Each structure stands twice: as structure tokens, then as C-alpha cells.
Design a protein around this ligand. Structure first.
Ligand SMILES: CC1(C)CCC(=O)N1Nc1ncnc2[nH]c3cc(F)ccc3c12
Length: 167
């Protein structure tokens, strides 16, 4: 038993709540929050920029030191850093960016990083809010992650509808 609430059981190990992942994290303070990051860990906007703003830029400061030491992540890769005031840890995961011509098959590799953690609060990766992409991000998540994943989806229409289209 954990402290997640209003999470609609999607499968044996996948759950979802109509929520902003940043606000979910502040309330729950989970062991692991997933950031939908880029390879440079430049948290300018989206979940990344909003989580970082919620850390008062401490996430960015820590990330810049990580990159200066280790260089960029791989598309499909991840690193574990501090969760600051939002979680014990933040798992920064990079899904393919199709607008950069990056192969979306790498989305499965991205979700495989979740299997190294027993429980995670996560947003949708390589999805966005338009077309069959966000819908696609969920199918790969369900078919790839075996650990317990709590998906926060901020957009209601997508939340409402991913549920209604879920096989
Ligand atoms: C793009 C994608 C990652 C996948 C589908 C989805 O809804 N996304 N965004 C978000 N994901 C998680 N929490 C969120 N909080 C928010 C608060 C806002 F004002 C605006 C957007 C979000 C948001």
C-alpha cells in the first residue's frame, strides 16, 4: 500500500490520475519522479521546465554539473539524480524526439529504464497531446514497464480519451 490516490487502475501494474505531475510530486513526495528530459538535461519548458521551476532551479544546477562531468545522455537513456523537494530521486529519461528525426522505436528503450525502479510517478514520454502519439506513448508504456507506474496526464481531453481508447 502506497499514498497514490484517484489512480485509475489501467492494468496489473499501470495506474493513471488526471493531474499535473509537478503537483502530484509535491503532494506525494514519491521515491522516484520521472522527468521527460532532453539529452542535455536543459529543463527549459514542459514537465522538465515546470519540475525545475518547482525546485527553484536546483534541478538545473545539479544537471549542469552532471553534464559537465559525464556528457550528454543517449536518446533512450536515463540518469538518476536528486528529487530535490519533489521526490527522493528524479529519474531523467530521454524519449526520442520525432521532430529531431529521432527514431520512435527508441521510446521502448526509454520506458525500459523504469524497470530499474519498483514504483515511479511518471508523465507520458515522446507523446505530446495531439494525434495518435500520446495515445501511442501509453501502449508502449503498458507493454514495456513491469514495475508499478503511476502516470499523471495533465491534459483532460487526452486523459479522458486515452482511457476511452485503451485496449
Ligand atoms: C506532454 C505530456 C508529457 C504528455 C501528455 C501530457 O498531458 N503532458 N504534459 C503534462 N504531463 C504531466 N503533468 C503536466 N502538468 C501540466 C500542467 C500544465 F499547465 C500543462 C501541462 C502539464 C503536464
Amino acid at each position: 500500500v502506497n499514498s497514490f490516490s484517484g489512480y485509475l487502475k489501467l492494468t496489473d501494474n499501470v495506474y493513471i490520475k488526471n493531474a499535473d505531475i509537478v503537483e502530484e510530486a509535491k503532494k506525494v513526495k514519491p521515491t522516484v519522479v520521472v522527468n521527460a528530459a532532453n539529452v542535455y538535461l536543459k529543463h527549459g519548458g514542459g514537465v522538465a521546465g515546470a519540475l525545475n521551476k518547482a525546485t527553484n532551479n536546483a534541478m538545473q544546477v545539479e544537471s549542469d554539473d552532471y553534464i559537465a562531468t559525464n556528457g550528454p545522455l543517449k536518446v533512450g537513456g536515463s540518469c538518476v539524480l536528486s528529487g530535490h523537494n519533489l521526490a527522493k530521486h528524479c529519474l531523467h529519461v530521454v524519449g526520442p524526439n520525432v521532430n529531431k528525426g529521432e527514431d520512435i522505436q527508441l521510446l521502448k528503450s526509454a520506458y525500459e529504464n523504469f524497470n530499474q525502479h519498483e514504483v515511479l510517478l511518471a508523465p507520458l514520454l515522446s507523446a505530446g497531446i495531439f494525434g495518435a502519439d500520446p495515445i501511442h506513448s501509453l501502449r508502449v508504456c503498458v507493454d514495456t514497464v513491469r514495475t508499478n507506474v503511476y502516470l499523471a496526464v495533465f491534459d483532460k481531453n487526452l486523459y479522458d480519451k486515452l482511457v476511452s481508447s485503451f485496449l
